[model samples]
Structure formats: C-alpha cells, structure tokens
Target: ADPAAGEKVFGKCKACHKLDGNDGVGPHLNGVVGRTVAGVDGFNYSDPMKAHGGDWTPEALQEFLTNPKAVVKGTKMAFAGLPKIEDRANLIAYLEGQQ
Candidate 1:
C-alpha cells in the first residue's frame, strides 16, 4: 500500500497520532513501522511498548495491529485493532514507506 493510501487508511489513528511528529493521544508515527514499538522520541510510552524493544518489522506490525491486546497485554493503546487482514496488510505497506 502506498503511504498516501496508508495516510487515508490511517485516518482512524489521526485522532491519536500526527504525521508531523507531534504526538496526540499516542506517539508520533512519522517513521514508526520500522522503529521499536512505542519508540517515538520524547513520548511517554505504555509498559508493554517499553518492554518491547524490538524493531517494528512488517510481520510484527501486521500481527500487532491486528490485535494490540493479543500482541501485548496491558498496552495503553486502546485501538481494537484492524480486523480485516487486507486492511492490516495495506496499513503495513503504507507504514513501511513512511520513513
């Protein structure tokens, strides 16, 4: 998925994240897909993300976005997660190109 299309798909996350690196309710996602979970600089992170020090690979993000709670319990991110597999794939594709 194209970042443009990902931006469109990410409208749902807009309420919490800003593309310009300014954080909203959540951390900034300007270059997030490859970064560590909750790795945004200067942003307060949830316990789960802080513990999760791995990079955000496509496969990892796909699974995490599909189910945040399942991926990591006690995460502060309250998103119910993308239910559709296709949407998750597209979102990952979009996020991968962001950086």
Candidate 2:
C-alpha cells in the first residue's frame, strides 16, 4: 500500500495517461480514483467501457486493475493489467491520494 511503489508502477501508464488534467492517448487520470467509469467528457470510450458504468472506487478498481479486459470485455485500454497484487494495491494507494 505504498504510494512510492505505486509511483514506480505508474511508469507503465506514463505513455498514455497523465496525472495532470489533460487528455492524451488515454483520458487524463486526474481525479480518477473516485471518478465514474469511462465517464471522462469528450474522451472516446468503448461501448463496453461506457456501458459498464460506475465510480472508480478502490474496491472496483481492485478488480478492474487486476484484469481490465475481463471486467469490460471490449475496453479501449490495451493495458495487460498488474498481475502483482501488491502493485495493484500500491498503485491504487497512489491514485487514491491525489489527482
């Protein structure tokens, strides 16, 4: 549950996501911890992701971050997901901290 470890893990997302509030290849992850699923305005989301609506609670993110495609069959993200449970929790701890 260390955010420092999470920051290191976040390097994986740097290519597509940003901590700043701006859209890139993927939607900006600012405020994502508690934000709604695929609900970022103007970002083109896959129907599967949009249809699978809900807030990005830590618990839900836990499952989704574990296996995104399995959660949303046709999500836009190409990320393979964090197989390491500690990495997942730490990443969540990081995102859960600030936007």
Candidate 3:
C-alpha cells in the first residue's frame, strides 16, 4: 500500500475527481477515506449512493472500485475499475494521504 505507487494508479481517476475539495465530473476526494457516502457539500451524488450511507473506508472503497455500479447500482461513473487488486490498494493508499 505505497501511497506513491498509488498516485500512479490514481491517474485514472484524475479525469473526473479532484483532491482539492472541488467538484469535477465526480466529487473532490480529499479525505474521502473517512468521508460519508454522498457527503460532499454541493456535489450531487446518485440516489443509491446517497441512500447507502456510510464512510468510504478502504474496505468499502475496494468494494466500490470492484465495480462502482455493482455496489451502488445507479452511479454515474462510466469508467471501468482498474481490474487489478494491487492497483486498487495503491490507489487507496494515495487517496488516504490526499488530506
């Protein structure tokens, strides 16, 4: 779970998410590791995601990243997951340090 290597994996999500607490295609992800599902102030999250309330812990993130729609059901994300477990671990590691 190297945060540095995770950054490389995180490049995939940069297209839609930001680490600066600003909304892009997705919500800003700074501190998302502990953030409540659909918790960002202004960003509009999917109904299912909003309905499924909880923090984005690393374990939960792994479940979501396995397939965003599989867990949340109606998410707006179109990008497929990274498909490799190591990539997810590293990506999560990097996200944990965004704060």
Candidate 4:
C-alpha cells in the first residue's frame, strides 16, 4: 500500500491522533508500528493497552487497528475500526513505512 494513500485514509484518525509524537486525544503514532503497544513516552495509556505489552508489528497492528476491542478487551481508543480490509492494510503499511 502506498504511504500517501494510507495518509489520506489516516485523515479519519487525525481528529484524535498525531504522527508527530505529540500527545493528542490518542497516543502519538510516530514509530508506533514496531514499538510496544501503548509505549509512547509520557503519555497516559489505557489499562488494557498498558497490559497488552507487546511489539506492534504489522500483523499485530493490523489486528488491533482493525478492531481495538478484539485485541484488548477494554481499550480506550474508542475507534470503531478502519472499516475496510484494504484501508487497514494501507494504514499498517504506512505505519511500517514510518519505521
């Protein structure tokens, strides 16, 4: 997936997230794909995410981003999901590219 196309889709996430490592309503997404889940520095994380404690490889991110609740039963992300498999793929592709 093209990072540019994924970025466009990421507009849906912009209201609550940021890729610049700044804390928004959601955690910063910079370098998030390969980092541990809920691992952002200095940001408060949902109890579920803090407990998830694993790396965010493409496969893992794909699952989580597609359905936060499925990955962590009580995540605070509040996002329903990316909705389309292709969009989720593109989002993971973009995040992995960032790494």
| Residue range 26-90, candidate 1, lDDT tens digits | 88777887787767778888877789778888888889888888988888888978888778777
Stretches > 4 Å off in candidate 3: none
For each candidate, give its TM-score against the true structure.
0.87, 0.94, 0.94, 0.90
Which model, 1 or 4, shows the larger lDDT? 4
Clashing pairs in 3: 6-90
Flag the better candidate by TM-score, 2 or 4.
Answer: 2
Q: How far does residue 43 in candidate 2 sit from its true spot (Å)? A: 0.6
Residue runs of model 1 more than 4 Å from their true location after superposition = 2-4
Misplaced by over 4 Å in model 4 are none
lDDT per residue for candidate 2 within 9-92, as digits (tens), equals 889889999988889889988689879998899999889988988889888887888888898898888988889999989988
Per-residue lDDT for 1-56 in model 4, tens only?
87777878888888998887788799878788778777787888888888987798
What lDDT does each candidate get?
0.79, 0.88, 0.87, 0.82
Candidate 2 deviant stretches above 4 angstroms: none
What's the count of clashing pairs in each model shown? 0, 0, 1, 0
Strongest candidate by lDDT? 2
Error of 4 at 48 (Å): 1.0
Poorest lDDT segment (10 consecutive residues) of candidate 3: 74-83
RMSD of 3: 0.9
**Position 99, candidate 3: lDDT:** 65
By summed lDDT, which 10 consecutive residues of candidate 1 come out lowest?
1-10
How well is each residue in 3-51 modelled by candidate 3, as lDDT tens digits? 9999998888989988887898999888899788999888887788789
What is residue 53's positional error in candidate 4, in angstroms?
Answer: 1.4
Error of 2 at 26 (Å): 0.8
